[PDB]
């Protein structure tokens, strides 16, 4: 068959303790780390099921998982039965829309992933989110991962993604355009697209380039 596997995000230790005891009572696989076997992401939300954007949130959508509210856990406890978590699926986030229903979109749109036919190179550096995690995100959304600017397949459409904050001693993010004929955009492009599960126009996110 197939087994329920949850991870949590936005929870405090004491809250985690609740989900742990909860997962123990009901025999639900609980883990530290999101993988392909992961079925549900349990998000801390407000009473309307809006959450903060965390890596686990992005990855839970990218993978088309059930991103449900931590209110499911508390409410199931309160009624001594496990409630249907579909009734608690996360509706939105404090950034992209309080009701954009990105989780539902990705869940129903696995056949038409948002990054089909796109080659993305995550041109480092980055912070608060490891380059391989950003890379896995795009892939899960149907993107093709290019390690090097040279590795761009010529003939698909290419996109270089950077986080200009991370650039310590460089304005070098304006030089990228030189070393390859491709659009350059901030990480917020990837993120905004994944949360809404809709591929954003690049115009807003483009980084000025020097020829």
């Amino acid at each position: 068959n197939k087994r329920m596997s949850m991870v949590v995000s936005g929870l405090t230790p004491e809250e985690f303790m609740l989900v742990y005891k909860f997962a123990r009572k009901h025999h639900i696989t609980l883990t530290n780390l999101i993988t392909e076997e992961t079925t549900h992401v349990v998000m801390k939300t407000d009473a309307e099921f809006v959450c903060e954007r965390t890596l686990k949130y992005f990855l839970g959508i990218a993978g088309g998982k059930w991103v449900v509210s931590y209110f499911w856990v508390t409410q199931s406890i309160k009624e001594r039965k496990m409630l249907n978590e579909h009734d608690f699926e996360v509706r939105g986030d404090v950034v992209n829309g309080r009701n954009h229903q990105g989780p539902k979109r990705a869940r129903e749109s696995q056949d038409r992933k948002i990054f089909r036919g796109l080659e993305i190179c995550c041109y480092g550096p980055f912070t608060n989110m490891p380059t391989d995690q950003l890379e896995w995100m795009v892939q899960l959304c149907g993107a093709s991962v290019v390690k090097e600017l040279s590795s761009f397949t010529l003939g698909v459409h290419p996109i270089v993604v950077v986080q200009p904050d991370a650039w310590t001693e460089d304005n070098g993010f304006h030089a990228i355009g030189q070393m390859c004929e491709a659009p350059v955009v901030t990480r917020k492009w990837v993120l905004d697209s994944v949360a809404l599960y809709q591929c954003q126009e690049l115009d807003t996110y483009l980084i000025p380039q020097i020829p």
Binding site: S9, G10, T12, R53, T54, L55, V94, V95, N128, L191
Partner: peptide, 7 residues
């Protein structure tokens, strides 16, 4: 939580 947020 300690997990990084993106806003």
């Amino acid at each position: 939580s300690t997990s990084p947020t993106f806003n």
